[PDB]
Structure formats: C-alpha cells, structure tokens
C-alpha cells in the first residue's frame with residue numbers, strides 16, 4: 001500500500017483510470033473533427049479551431065486525473081485510446097450533435113464516478129469532481145446545445161449559406 | 173404632515189406610488205424576456221442581453237421615483253409586482269412587439285401623471301417627468317420601433333436566418 | 345425534454361423557481377427598508393444605503409438562479425413578487441431584527457433545496473448551493489446578528505443618541 | 517422698450533426684482549447664523565460653515581436673477597436688504613428650524629412666480645425656474661428636514677452632548 005494512501009478505495013482508483021481513458025477518447029474525437037473541418041472540401045476554419053480547442057481542454061482534463069491518481073496514492077494504468085466512431089463528420093450540425101452526445105457521455109461517467117465516491121464515502125474525490133469537472137461539463141453542454149439550436153434555425157444541413165454565416169459570426 | 177411637504181397633493185403622491193409599481197412591473201417583464209432568449213432552445217444571447225439591460229434601466233426608473241417620493245415628503249407604499257403576461261415570448265419579433273406596447277403603456281402612464289400634476293399645479297413634479305422620464309421613453313420607443321421594422325424586413329417570424337442575422341449585427 | 349437536460353429532476357426544477365421568487369421577495373423587502381430609512385422623519389442614510397446594497401445583492405442571487413435553470417435545461421417560471429410584510433420598519437433595531445429573520449428564512453429554503461437535491465442525487469445542484477449560496481448566507485446572518493447586539497448595547501429602541509452613533513460608525 | 521424684450525410682462529419683471537431681494541434677504545439671514553455659531557460661547561464651527569456656504573449659495577441665486585432680468589430686457593431695481601428676524605439663534609435645532617421655514621418661504625415665492633409666468637404665458641421664465649431653482653429648493657428643504665429629525669433624536673435642545681456629536685459627524 002502507498003504510504004500516502006488514506007480513505008481511497010480500490011474501486012475508485014480503477015474508476016479514475018477508466019475516466020482518464022474516456023477523457024483521452026473525447027480529446028481524440030475532437031481532434032478528428034478539427035481535421036475534418038480543415039479539409040479543403042469542407043473548409044470551415046473557425047469551426048475547426050473550436051474543436052481543436054476542445055481537444056486540448058479534454059487532454060488537460062485527462063492530465064488532471066493522472067495527477068489526482070498519484071496524489072491519492074493510486075496507480076495510473078493506461079489503456080488503448082480508441083479511434084473515433086466516425087472518419088468523417090458530415091457538416092457543422094452533424095458534428096455538433098455528435099459533440100453534444102459525447103459531452104453527455106462524459107458527464108454521465110463523471111456522475112457515475114461521483115455515485116461510487118459517495119457509496120465509498122470519499123469526500124475528497126466527491127469535491128474534486130464537483131468543483132473541477134461537473135460545472136465545466138454543464139457549461140460545455142449548454143454552449144453546444146445553443147449552437148445546435150442556431151444551426152437548425154440557419155437551415156442546416158441543407159442551407160450552405162447558413163453554415164457559412166455560423167462559421168463567420170458564432171465561433172470566430 | 174411631513175415637515176418638508178409643500179405643494180404636494182395627496183393624489184399626486186398616490187399616483188407616484190402607482191407609477192413606481194408599473195416601472196417595477198416593466199422591469200420584471202424585461203427580465204422574463206432575458207430568461208426566454210437565454211433558453212437553450214432559443215439561444216439568442218445578444219437579444220437576451222438587450223432585454224436584461226432594459227430590465228436594469230426600468231428598476232433604476234423605479235428607484236428614482238422612490239427617492240422622489242421621499243424628497244417631497246410623500247410616503248412610499250409598495251404593492252405586489254405582478255408576473256409578466258406571458259411565460260414564453262415566441263421569437264425576437266413577438267418579443268419586440270410586446271416591448272413596444274409595454275413602453276407605450278409606461279409612456280401613457282407618465283403622460284397621465286403629468287396631466288394630474290398640471291391639474292394640481294405642481295411644477296416640480298411636471299419638470300421631473302419632463303426632464304427625467306419623457307425623453308427617454310420617446311427614445312426607447314423609437315429604438316424598438318426601428319428594430320421591429322428591421323425584423324419584419326428580415327422575414328420574421330418565418331425566416332430563421334434573418335433572426336440570426338439580427339442578433340449578430342443589431343444588438344451585438 | 346430539453347436537449348441539454350441531464351440528471352435534472354422536475355421537482356428540483358420547480359424548487360429552483362420557488363427559490364428565485366423568494367430571492368426576489370427578499371430584494372423587495374430590503375428596498376422597502378431603504379425607502380423607510382430615507383424618509384425625512386427617519387433620516388438614517390448610511391442605514392438606508394446598507395439595505396439598498398442588500399436589495400441589489402438579493403436581485404443578483406435571483407438572476408443567478410435564472411441562469412442556473414437555463415443551463416440545466418429547466419424552464420424559468422415566474423410568479424408575483426409579494427409586497428413586504430410591513431410598510432414601515434420602526435427603527436434600526438426593528439429593521440435589523442426583521443432582516444435577520446428574512447435571511448434565516450432564505451437560508452432555510454436553501455438548505456431545504458439542498459435536501460431535495462441530495463434526495464434526487466444531483467451533485468451539480470448541491471455544489472452550486474454549497475459554493476455559491478450557503479457561505480454568503482452564513483456571513484450575512486453573522487453580520488446582521490453582530491449589528492443587533494450592538495444596537496441593543498447602544499440602548500435601542502429608546503436611545504436615539506445610540507441610533508445616531510450606530511449610523512455614523514457602523515455602516516458608514 | 518428694450519430692443520431685446522419679447523414676451524416679457526411688466527408684472528413678471530417686477531416679481532423677478534422682488535425674488536432677487538428675497539434671495540438676498542435669505543443670504544443675509546444665513547450669514548447671521550454663521551456669525552452666531554462662530555461665537556466663543558456657541559462654538560460649533562462645522563455648523564457655522566454649513567450656514568456660511570448656504571449664504572454664498574443664496575447670493576449666487578440672486579446674481580442669477582440679475583443676469584436673467586438683463587437677458588430678457590427688464591431692469592434690475594434694488595431695494596433695502598432687511599436685517600434678519602433674530603440677532604441670536606439659540607442652538608443648532610432652533611437655527612435649522614428657522615432655516616427650514618426660510619427655505620419654504622423662498623420656495624413658495626418661486627412657486628408663486630411660476631404661477632404668474634404661467635398666467636402671462638412666459639415659457640422661458642417657467643423653464644428657468646423649473647430647471648435652475650425648484651429642484652435645488654426641494655433638495656435643500658429635504659436636507660434640512662433630515663437634520664432636524666436627527667437633532668431631535670439626539671435630544672436637542674437639552675442634550676449638549678448630542679449637539680456636539682451632530683457638529684462632529686453630520687456637517688463636518
């Protein structure tokens with residue numbers, strides 16, 4: 001047992017490793033979206049940059065779980081980072097819809113980790129999630145939802161002029 | 173009778189209390205519009221902020237009537253602030269149309285208070301209204317009318333692209 | 345169901361609307377106290393300004409609940425803002441006593457909302473209350489209690505010199 | 517007839533001269549109060565300075581009526597400035613009570629001049645009074661009333677400690 005370990009259940013340690021992997025999976029999905037929107041036959045560079053920034057954010061979320069694991073005396077165990085579910089993302093609306101579902105998947109995993117930490121009576125892990133993860137997820141979900149509403153209003157997927165307008169006034 | 177009171181008719185004092193309540197009612201209506209445009213399924217944040225600012229302005233108009241009442245030696249009497257007439261505001265045009273009618277309602281109440289002050293021969297109250305309230309009402313009514321004209325030109329309520337364009341170039 | 349909604353119980357959504365209304369009710373009560381202390385026959389302007397500031401604070405607390413409701417995908421539903429329980433507040437001690445009970449009423453409502461969020465297993469709402477509301481309530485309750493102790497020590501309600509001294513050295 | 521004169525009734529011209537004299541009479545009364553509070557056996561120097569400042573203000577009000585008279589083509593006609601009604605002013609409360617009645621006397625004269633200007637249909641004179649005189653009178657009356665309330669609360673005229681406290685915290 002690590003000399004620093006105190007009130008840290010093996011189940012929580014394992015779930016933190018799984019959460020780290022999911023953050024990395026999300027980062028990789030966002031990077032795929034960045035690459036898609038940078039294609040010469042897609043060419044929506046403000047949209048591409050939005051997804052690149054989200055890729056960076058998710059990787060930082062992962063690094064923070066690595067640091068957390070070590071601080072508590074757990075051991076980081078890495079697994080393969082699976083490739084994204086799609087190779088091409090259609091258009092800005094389709095990609096934002098996919099991002100919304102990904103953010104809700106991540107949020108559900110965070111909520112499930114919080115349930116586990118509650119069951120094992122780990123207030124440090126609970127507060128870490130509450131103060132460092134759950135509010136940013138809710139903010140990101142709201143932002144992406146707002147974008148989806150606007151893209152539908154702009155006539156996506158059919159209205160290419162609307163798609164151009166979005167790239168030029170909403171993510172600039 | 174208050175030691176400061178001079179040339180202040182009971183009827184005017186009461187009408188000032190009623191005017192205070194109407195300013196508060198208007199502030200609350202605008203706050204409702206702010207909340208509607210901040211919804212994830214509406215998502216027009218520059219429009220929401222316009223209404224939030226107008227909510228603030230109306231509350232300041234109310235505070236100034238409270239201060240006026242005390243300066244003249246009248247007594248502030250508060251009543252319930254009624255909830256807005258609608259829970260949802262449709263779209264930017266529908267909301268601006270509602271705001272125009274609200275501003276005209278407030279302006280009519282100010283004009284009616286001025287008639288009363290004239291009848292009771294209260295030049296201080298008349299000038300307060302003339303110099304602190306009536307010109308801002310006319311300016312606000314003109315601004316909202318100009319917005320309505322533009323929203324109709326942009327094809328509201330049917331044209332969602334027009335609604336997006338307005339939010340991005342007229343209230344930014 | 346809103347596209348952003350996740351782990352947000354209808355009961356919590358409704359209780360957030362009720363909490364918003366209570367914050368607005370508190371703001372309105374404080375504004376009444378401001379107006380009372382600004383009267384020419386009361387004339388304690390540092391006390392009036394203290395209550396005006398608290399009125400502002402409470403309105404900001406309400407706006408933050410509106411924003412919260414939308415972020416979670418709930419719908420803001422407004423009700424009448426009831427007028428304050430009194431039209432006149434007696435003196436500085438009587439008003440501070442009323443403010444203490446109002447702040448404890450608000451705090452009890454926050455604690456009850458936290459119980460509901462706990463029962464429905466909503467850690468985001470729990471942390472929002474814990475980190476954005478509960479500590480400010482405890483601080484405000486302590487400040488007002490400290491003022492009450494000082495006002496009693498100064499001989500309120502009978503000792504007018506004490507009341508003047510308080511206005512000039514404790515809320516300046 | 518003056519070459520500049522237009523829509524200026526002889527009655528209004530005469531009433532402006534009488535108003536000028538009353539402003540000068542008020543200035544002189546305030547100067548008497550300044551001198552009283554500067555006496556070695558009274559010795560309330562912040563109170564004395566308050567009245568000195570009001571003396572200055574009233575003299576400026578008079579000069580502005582002189583300038584007004586000439587601008588309209590009327591002729592300034594001066595009369596004796598009568599000495600104040602009292603040679604000694606008792607104490608801070610007695611003096612503030614006298615100042616309140618003086619300010620209300622001046623305000624009544626301004627309101628009466630406004631009635632005359634209304635009857636003779638002189639909008640320039642009406643607006644001059646409304647915008648340059650009536651609001652300052654209401655503000656001054658409110659301030660002095662607030663002081664009277666505080667002086668009574670402090671136990672004047674009997675409570676000398678209260679009188680000292682006022683001079684040190686309310687007019688400093």
Ligand SMILES: [Cl-]
Pocket residue numbers: 005006007008009
């Ligand atoms: Cl352990």
Ligand SMILES: [Cl-]
Pocket residue numbers: 008009010011
């Ligand atoms: Cl274990």
Ligand SMILES: [Cl-]
Pocket residue numbers: 057060061136
């Ligand atoms: Cl972050």
Ligand SMILES: [Cl-]
Pocket residue numbers: none
């Ligand atoms: Cl696998």
Ligand SMILES: [Cl-]
Pocket residue numbers: 085086087088
């Ligand atoms: Cl694919």
Ligand SMILES: [Cl-]
Pocket residue numbers: 101102103105
């Ligand atoms: Cl997903």
Ligand SMILES: [Cl-]
Pocket residue numbers: 130131132133134135136137
């Ligand atoms: Cl966070």
Ligand SMILES: [Cl-]
Pocket residue numbers: 177178179180181
């Ligand atoms: Cl009156």
Ligand SMILES: [Cl-]
Pocket residue numbers: 180181182183
């Ligand atoms: Cl009356």
Ligand SMILES: [Cl-]
Pocket residue numbers: 229232233308
């Ligand atoms: Cl304004």
Ligand SMILES: [Cl-]
Pocket residue numbers: none
């Ligand atoms: Cl009713």
Ligand SMILES: [Cl-]
Pocket residue numbers: 257258259260
């Ligand atoms: Cl409705």
Ligand SMILES: [Cl-]
Pocket residue numbers: 273274275277
């Ligand atoms: Cl209306």
Ligand SMILES: [Cl-]
Pocket residue numbers: 303647
């Ligand atoms: Cl003006």
Ligand SMILES: [Cl-]
Pocket residue numbers: 302303304305306307308309
């Ligand atoms: Cl105005």
Ligand SMILES: [Cl-]
Pocket residue numbers: 349350351352353
């Ligand atoms: Cl839900």
